[PDB]
Amino acid sequence: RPESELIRQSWRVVSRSPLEHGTVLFARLFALEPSLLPLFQYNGRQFSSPEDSLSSPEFLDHIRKVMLVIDAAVTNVEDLSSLEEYLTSLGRKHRAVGVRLSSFSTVGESLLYMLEKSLGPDFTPATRTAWSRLYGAVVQAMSRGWDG
Numbered sequence: 001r002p003e004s005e006l007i008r009q010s011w012r013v014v015s016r017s018p019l020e021h022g023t024v025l026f027a028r029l030f031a032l033e034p035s036l037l038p039l040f041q042y043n044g045r046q047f048s049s050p051e052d053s054l055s056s057p058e059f060l061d062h063i064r065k066v067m068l069v070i071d072a073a074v075t076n077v078e079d080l081s082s083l084e085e086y087l088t089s090l091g092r093k094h095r096a097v098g099v100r101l102s103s104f105s106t107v108g109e110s111l112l113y114m115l116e117k118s119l120g121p122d123f124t125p126a127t128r129t130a131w132s133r134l135y136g137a138v139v140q141a142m143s144r145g146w147d148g
């Protein structure tokens with residue numbers, strides 16, 4: 001795919017600083033859907049406010065993990081048979097921690113938000129569309145984990 005290069009080129013900008021950019025993604029996510037905050041239960045404690053998650057090493061590690069999985073998707077943008085089974089398993093894991101599959105739409109919007117804000121004018125409509133397609137494919141693989 002040649003929309004694979006829009007993804008690779010737009011990801012290089014953000015992939016150099018995964019935590020900063022993933023923080024934008026999660027800040028956006030909780031602004032859009034505050035009910036996701038309690039799903040991050042580290043040491044059986046709930047974050048009261050979004051900003052509390054940003055002081056949590058475990059939550060920031062989760063942002064790193066998310067950026068690593070997105071980086072794997074970018075690396076395999078032509079692929080996604082390398083990752084199908086891993087994503088399913090990642091879906092099952094999220095289902096288990098209580099994430100509703102529908103929340104991954106908000107995540108998608110957060111990721112697109114974050115890429116728009118990082119790329120400015122370089123986040124063309126084509127780049128947007130490419131990412132929506134890639135993210136959609138990632139979620140489709142993960143959705144198998146909600147065993148449907």
Ligand code: HEM
Pocket residue numbers: 036039040041058059061062065066067069070090093094097099103104107
């Ligand atoms: C609504 C959005 C999400 C929520 C509420 C969420 C929540 C969680 C929680 C609570 C865990 C277990 C604790 C931890 O490892 O920190 C987890 C694991 C993980 N999440 Fe997320 N997550 C979300 C989205 C994502 C997305 C979109 C990705 C990937 C692009 C992702 C990648 C990971 C990874 C890599 C793990 C470790 C899975 C394992 O090996 O056990 N998460 N998530």
